[PDB]
Amino acid sequence: LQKRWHNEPLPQILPCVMDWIPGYDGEHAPDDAEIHYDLPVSFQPPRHLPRFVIRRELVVGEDVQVSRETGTSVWRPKGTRADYNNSEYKKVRAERL
Amino acid sequence: MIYLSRLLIDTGGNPDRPRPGRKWLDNIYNVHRRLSMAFPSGLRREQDPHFLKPFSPNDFQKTPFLFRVDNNIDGNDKRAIIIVQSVLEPDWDYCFQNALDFLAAPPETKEYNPEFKAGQLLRFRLRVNASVRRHIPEMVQQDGQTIETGKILHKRVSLTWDASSTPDQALADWLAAKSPKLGFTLQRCELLQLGWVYGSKPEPKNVKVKEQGQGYWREHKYNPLRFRAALLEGVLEVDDPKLFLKTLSSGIGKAKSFGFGLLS
Numbered sequence: 047l048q049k050r051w052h053n054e055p056l057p058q059i060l061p062c063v064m065d066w067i068p069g070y071d072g073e074h075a076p077d078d079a080e081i082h083y084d085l086p087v088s089f090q091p092p093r094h095l096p097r098f099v100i101r102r103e104l105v106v107g108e109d110v111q112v113s114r115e116t117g118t119s120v121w122r123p124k125g126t127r128a129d130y131n132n133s134e135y136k137k138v139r140a141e142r143l
Numbered sequence: 144m145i146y147l148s149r150l151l152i153d154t155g156g157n158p159d160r161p162r163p164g165r166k167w168l169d170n171i172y173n174v175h176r177r178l179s180m181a182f183p184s185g186l187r188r189e190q191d192p193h194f195l196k197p198f199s200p201n202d203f204q205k206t207p208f209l210f211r212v213d214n215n216i217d218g219n220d221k222r223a224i225i226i227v228q229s230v231l232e233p234d235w236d237y238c239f240q241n242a243l244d245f246l247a248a249p250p251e252t253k254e255y256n257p258e259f260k261a262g263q264l265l266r267f268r269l270r271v272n273a274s275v276r277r278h279i280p281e282m283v284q285q286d287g288q289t290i291e292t293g294k295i296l297h298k299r300v301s302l303t304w305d306a307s308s309t310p311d312q313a314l315a316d317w318l319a320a321k322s323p324k325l326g327f328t329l330q331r332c333e334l335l336q337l338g339w340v341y342g343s344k345p346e347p348k349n350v351k352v353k354e355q356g357q358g359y360w361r362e363h364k365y366n367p368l369r370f371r372a373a374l375l376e377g378v379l380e381v382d383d384p385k386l387f388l389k390t391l392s393s394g395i396g397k398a399k400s401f402g403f404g405l406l407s
Contacts (some may be wrong), residue, residue, distance in 0.1 A: 141361065
């Protein structure tokens with residue numbers, strides 16, 4: 047699971063929308079599964095079929111986790127400063143001297 | 144063609160403020176450099192009047208010339224005097240155009256031409272080196288146990304005069320004997336100043352190399368140079384007014400660049 051900036055609020059519960067699994071033939075849907083009408087049998091013009099949708103939940107930590115962010119979104123134009131000598135100021139001062 | 148003139152420099156009076164002329168007078172290599180970038184050229188004169196360009200001595204005219212730094216009192220003020228003369232016209236409006244702190248009063252150009260014929264009593268001082276090539280450059284005395292290792296080296300060492308006299312009748316004998324060569328004579332000579340003069344000259348070298356061209360990458364080096372000084376005067380009688388003018392155009396001794404020049 048991604049993260050855009052470092053100090054960002056993160057949803058600790060991730061809602062899951064899942065279809066209906068017929069575990070055995072003749073299974074009836076649980077009495078919390080709302081019907082969504084997103085199932086096309088043709089496309090143009092739109093004719094549709096309904097489907098069963100089961101709510102599900104996911105808290106972070108057991109299988110899902112945050113990802114590495116990096117990628118600094120702060121520009122602030124770069125510029126070095128304050129170099130007395132690493133090894134190449136002693137030798138380069140004399141050239142124009 | 145005498146172009147005798149003066150350059151009265153600004154000695155300070157506070158060794159807490161920076162003093163440019165006083166520091167400049169302590170190094171005769173830079174003294175010669177300062178006196179020599181004057182009358183620079185007409186090659187790039189029409190380009191810039193502001194003396195803001197990368198320096199290169201090749202653009203400057205390589206005419207040998209002379210100067211001498213001395214001290215005098217006019218009537219009420221000590222001020223060190225620099226006397227110069229050259230075959231080219233004076234144009235000190237560019238050598239000091241951004242270093243006006245080097246100067247005290249604006250410089251003045253005079254016109255003078257000599258005439259002495261023979262045997263008058265109206266002559267002046269002189270500056271020279273006491274430089275002689277050594278009779279016995281003894282085999283390079285080395286160090287470690289105060290020993291002698293080397294073979295020979297012809298060096299222009301200082302003049303080793305006698306040990307039972309003083310140099311106001313030893314160097315006096317020296318230039319009295321030297322005078323009939325250069326076309327004059329000395330009836331009296333008393334020295335005023337003697338000693339050493341020091342300087343420093345930089346040597347460009349080359350050790351490192353560059354990966355895409357020739358060896359631009361390179362280091363610095365300095366070397367010292369020393370000379371023996373003699374400032375003295377005399378009431379002199381010129382032998383002939385036909386060969387002494389060459390001596391008045393070259394000077395007794397030819398340090399030239401390093402101070403010791405002609406009779407003044």
